[PDB]
Amino acid sequence: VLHQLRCNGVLEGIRICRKGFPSRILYADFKQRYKVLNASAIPEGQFIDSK
């Protein structure tokens, strides 16, 4: 599997997307899954828009 991943360019595609920004998360998902982190930063229920 390692030899095949080297020869077929899958290992190149992972080093390519690490040059860029590979992980792409919606504003809603980022707020809804991860609110637990930062209660001090993320205030009241007036904080809609989600941006």
Binding site: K35, V36, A39, E44
Partner: protein, 148 residues
């Protein structure tokens, strides 16, 4: 520094806990002296800078009133204790279906199996009977009852 009013309130709580008449509170009780003054200290807060011994362990040390006064000021009165906003989004980790409802078994399991673990005796004592059919427990109602 504390007010004269705060010193007298802290003293009024103290004069109950030294119940043998010694002018001295047993060290085990100090976390529950803090709870008696309306602060909510963790057992991790209690064993560090408040200087408490083991849990439920008596005799090892005693504390004079003047010694207790920085042990209110520099401890739970020098930190965050959590608010409503904490509890609502901590409970929403266990809100599977988004309705403000958590199973009573799951809520008892979070209290007994996670964190600074609660006795089942404690869990029943804090339970206001708010369990329906399989409509289960409204967790916001639970937080508002426990913070009143």
């Amino acid at each position: 520094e504390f007010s004269k009013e705060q010193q007298e309130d802290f003293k009024e709580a103290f004069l109950l806990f030294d119940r043998t008449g010694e002018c001295k509170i047993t060290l085990s009780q100090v976390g529950d002296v803090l709870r008696a003054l309306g602060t909510n200290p963790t057992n991790a807060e209690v064993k560090k800078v408040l200087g408490n011994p083991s849990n439920e362990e008596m005799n090892a040390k005693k504390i004079e009133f003047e010694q207790f006064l920085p042990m209110m000021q520099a401890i739970s009165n020098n930190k965050d204790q959590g608010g409503y906003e904490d509890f609502v989004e901590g409970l929403r980790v266990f809100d599977k279906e988004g309705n403000g409802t958590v199973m009573g078994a799951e809520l008892r399991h979070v209290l007994a199996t996670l964190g600074e673990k609660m006795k089942e005796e404690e869990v029943e004592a804090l339970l206001a009977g708010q369990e329906d059919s399989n409509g289960c427990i409204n967790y916001e109602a639970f937080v508002k009852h426990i913070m009143s």
